[PDB]
Structure formats: structure tokens, C-alpha cells
Design a binder for this molecule. Structure first.
Ligand SMILES: C[C@H](CCC(=O)NCCC[N+](C)(C)CCCS(=O)(=O)[O-])[C@H]1CC[C@H]2[C@@H]3[C@H](O)C[C@@H]4C[C@H](O)CC[C@]4(C)[C@H]3C[C@H](O)[C@]12C
Ligand SMILES: Nc1ncnc2c1ncn2[C@@H]1O[C@H](CSCC[C@H](N)C(=O)O)[C@@H](O)[C@H]1O
Ligand code: SF4
Ligand SMILES: [Cl-]
Ligand SMILES: [Cl-]
Ligand SMILES: [Cl-]
Ligand SMILES: [Cl-]
Length: 356
């Protein structure tokens, strides 16, 4: 019959940016934004996200000092170096005293939030965690937990102990892919944990990997819409990095640009959310965290795990620099912040509601 030509790419690209600026976040708009492979479009997207960042979360880059206190995990996620079937990794557990005193040292170096992260290690759950949380809360700082999926009763105990925030990335909002990559659990379980945490009054963090095997652009759009639906306080996003001692060893690595676009779109969708420049972004590209901080991120998470454990928390290859002294990360990120013309957080850096 009659013809159906495409609009010119330049004019399409400009209309998408205009729709984002007017906050018309249709599925087709988000899909096209993630599908365009044009450096000028991408740069404009990043500039929009940076503008939104400046307006609604300002110039503070919040520093969260993480202690990865055990690499023992009862789960078997296909992507993760810590999966239980990986026997080519030395496992470790830190004592409560080691954890508490290491947190105290971060606080003295100026960290206003301590993040405690581990594999799903039953040793500590729930009472050892509670005791550690109570001790760190006496230091005058925020406490964030990232311990995986546990019963409501454990989450309730940890909140009573004084925990402020919980990070539980949704990983992938595609339920079919979620079950294939995380064969012990389900997207439904993961979402129920996130809903429970919010109900209990935690500030909650979700987020996802970009470039997982079997994940499409339509799946990434579903990730963005899920994030928007829940108005998450925090969103952690990074590229999938294949680990050699996992079933996903020979799969494609996630793409840096596409991941940066996911960060920028997250900022645009959730203007006053706390969004880190993740270590995975710094792993895949030299200076990756600094780039991400100019594309909508406003949080950085220096690695505060001590030797000799630090080098064993091998979620993905390249994660830990072996040349670094284990107290170098906090000063390092402070210098990075200074060089970007930003400033460290003044207070605990809790999510505020200033948009709308
Ligand atoms: C290291 C400097 C030199 C050129 C800089 C980038 C370019 O300017 C393009 C782009 C502009 C955005 O504005 C912010 C993001 C981005 C990627 C910059 C970030 C970063 O700072 C770069 C990589
Ligand atoms: N191969 C890989 N590439 C990139 N990020 C990875 C990865 N393996 C794991 N991660 C990320 O590292 C995060 C921490 S795992 C530790 C916390 C807890 N076990 C949990 O699963 O929530 C995960 O949420 C995941 O998104
Ligand atoms: S992602 Fe978290 S739950 Fe899954 S294997 Fe790794 S440490 Fe365990
Ligand atoms: Cl945090
Ligand atoms: Cl994160
Ligand atoms: Cl990361
Ligand atoms: Cl670091």
C-alpha cells in the first residue's frame, strides 16, 4: 500500500529528550532512550540527569563505608562468586569485635554511615547482627544492612537494634529470569522482603544488574518502572561482570554506557533518591565511579573490609585492588569528591522528600 518511513534519528532523539524533560515516562519513551546509540543523545541524557541531581540532592556525595564481614553464602546465584557451589574460594567470617572496631575506625575517619554486608551466612542471624548494630549505633552514625533475604522477625529485630537502612537489590524484575539466575528463591520473595523492610520503617534500597544473560532492553525498562513504582530511597545499579568460577563465566559483560544510561534514567525518574556510583562501575572502566557521579549519582561506597578478608569477597573479578592499604579507601574517595568540585555529606545523608 502506502509507505511508513521512520522519522529522522536526530529529530526522534530530540523528541525523546523533550519527553523526559516534561516527565512523560511512557514505556516507549524509556525503551527508545535505552535503544539510541548516539553519543550526543547520551550526553544530553547525562546532562539532564546531572541537572536533576544538582536541583534535588545538591552537591554532597554521601560516603557509606562498607564492611563485607563474611563471604559465606547459603544461596547459589548463578552470577555470584560467593555462590555456595564455588569451592575455589577461601571462606571467612569476621568476629563481632573485629567488625565493631573496624566500624569504629571508619567513624573516626569521618564515615557517617556504616554498611554491613555479607553472604547469607546463618552464623550471625539474627542475634549476632543485633548486637553489632547496637554497638555501632552508639558511635553516632547511621547503620545500613545488606544481608539478603531473611524472615520478617529478623528484620524486625535488626530494626529494634537500631538499623536505619537495608539494601536488597531486586537484581531483575523479570520473574522468569530471576528464578533462573537465583534458583533458591524468586522475584516474589525478593519483593516481599523489600515490602516488609519498608513497612518496618527502614530506608530501603533496590536496584539491578545491567547486561545479565537473557536480559533485554524491555527487561531494563521493566526495572526502571519497578523502581519508579516503589519510590525507592536508594537504587544500586551496576553492570553484570562475569565471574570465572560461576556458570555465567563465558557470558557477555554488561555494557558501561548502557549501565550509565540506567543510572541517569533512575535519577530522572526518582529525583531525590540516593544513587551510588558503584564499585562495579569503577571496575569496568578506569574512572568509572567519577563518570557515574557526573551522570546522576550522589553516593560513594568506599571498601572498608580489612585484610586479609577484603581480597576474598570476590563477587566478580577486579573488584578489590591488591595494591591498596585497607585504610586507603575513605581518604581516596574524599579526594575524588574534592577533585569533582563536590563535597562530602554533612549529616547521615538520609533520603529527603524535596521533589514535588
Ligand atoms: C575524564 C573526563 C574527560 C571527559 C569527561 C566526559 C565527557 O565530558 C563526556 C561526558 C560529559 C558529561 O557532562 C559527564 C559525563 C561525561 C562522560 C564526562 C565524564 C568525565 O568527567 C570525563 C570522562
Ligand atoms: N557478577 C556480578 N556482577 C555484578 N554485580 C554483581 C555480581 N554478583 C553479584 N553482584 C551484586 O552484588 C550485590 C551484593 S551480594 C551481598 C548481599 C546479599 N547476599 C544480597 O544478595 O543481597 C548483589 O545484589 C548483586 O547485584
Ligand atoms: S548475590 Fe548475595 S545471595 Fe546470591 S550468592 Fe552472592 S552473596 Fe549469596
Ligand atoms: Cl546507605
Ligand atoms: Cl549499591
Ligand atoms: Cl558494585
Ligand atoms: Cl573503594
Amino acid at each position: 500500500m502506502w509507505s511508513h518511513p521512520q522519522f529522522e534519528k536526530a529529530s526522534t532523539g530530540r523528541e525523546i529528550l523533550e519527553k523526559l524533560e516534561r516527565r512523560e515516562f511512557t514505556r516507549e519513551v524509556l525503551k527508545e532512550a535505552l535503544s539510541i546509540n548516539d553519543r550526543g543523545f547520551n550526553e544530553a541524557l547525562f546532562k539532564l540527569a546531572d541537572e536533576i541531581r544538582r536541583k534535588y540532592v545538591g552537591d554532597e556525595v554521601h560516603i557509606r563505608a562498607i564492611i563485607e564481614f563474611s563471604n559465606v553464602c547459603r544461596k547459589n546465584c548463578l552470577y555470584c562468586g560467593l555462590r555456595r557451589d564455588n569451592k575455589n574460594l577461601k571462606r571467612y567470617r569476621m568476629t563481632p569485635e573485629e567488625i565493631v572496631e573496624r566500624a569504629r575506625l571508619a567513624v573516626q575517619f569521618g564515615a557517617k554511615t556504616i554498611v554491613l554486608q555479607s553472604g547469607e551466612d546463618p552464623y550471625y542471624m539474627p542475634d549476632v547482627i543485633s548486637d553489632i548494630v547496637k554497638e555501632i549505633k552508639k558511635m553516632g552514625v547511621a547503620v545500613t544492612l545488606s544481608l539478603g533475604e531473611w524472615p520478617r522477625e529478623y528484620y524486625e529485630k535488626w530494626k529494634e537494634a537500631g538499623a536505619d537502612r537495608y539494601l536488597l537489590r531486586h537484581e531483575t524484575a523479570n520473574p522468569v529470569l530471576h528464578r533462573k539466575l537465583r534458583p533458591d528463591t524468586s522475584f516474589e520473595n525478593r519483593l516481599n522482603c523489600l515490602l516488609t523492610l519498608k513497612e518496618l520503617g527502614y530506608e530501603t534500597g533496590a536496584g539491578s544488574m545491567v547486561g545479565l544473560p537473557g536480559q533485554t532492553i524491555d527487561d531494563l525498562v521493566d526495572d526502571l518502572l519497578f523502581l519508579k513504582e516503589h519510590d525507592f530511597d536508594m537504587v544500586g545499579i551496576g553492570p553484570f561482570i562475569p565471574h570465572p568460577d560461576t556458570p555465567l563465566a563465558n557470558e557477555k559483560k554488561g555494557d558501561f554506557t548502557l549501565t550509565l544510561k540506567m543510572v541517569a534514567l533512575t535519577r530522572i525518574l526518582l529525583p531525590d533518591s540516593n544513587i551510588p556510583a558503584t564499585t562495579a562501575m569503577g571496575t569496568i572502566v578506569p574512572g568509572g565511579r567519577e563518570i557515574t557521579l557526573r551522570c546522576g549519582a550522589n553516593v560513594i561506597i568506599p571498601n572498608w573490609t580489612p585484610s586479609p578478608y577484603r581480597q576474598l569477597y570476590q563477587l566478580y573479578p577486579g573488584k578489590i585492588s591488591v595494591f591498596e592499604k585497607d585504610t586507603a579507601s575513605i581518604p581516596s574517595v574524599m579526594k575524588m569528591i574534592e577533585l569533582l568540585g563536590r563535597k562530602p555529606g554533612r549529616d547521615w545523608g538520609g533520603r529527603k522528600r524535596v521533589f514535588e
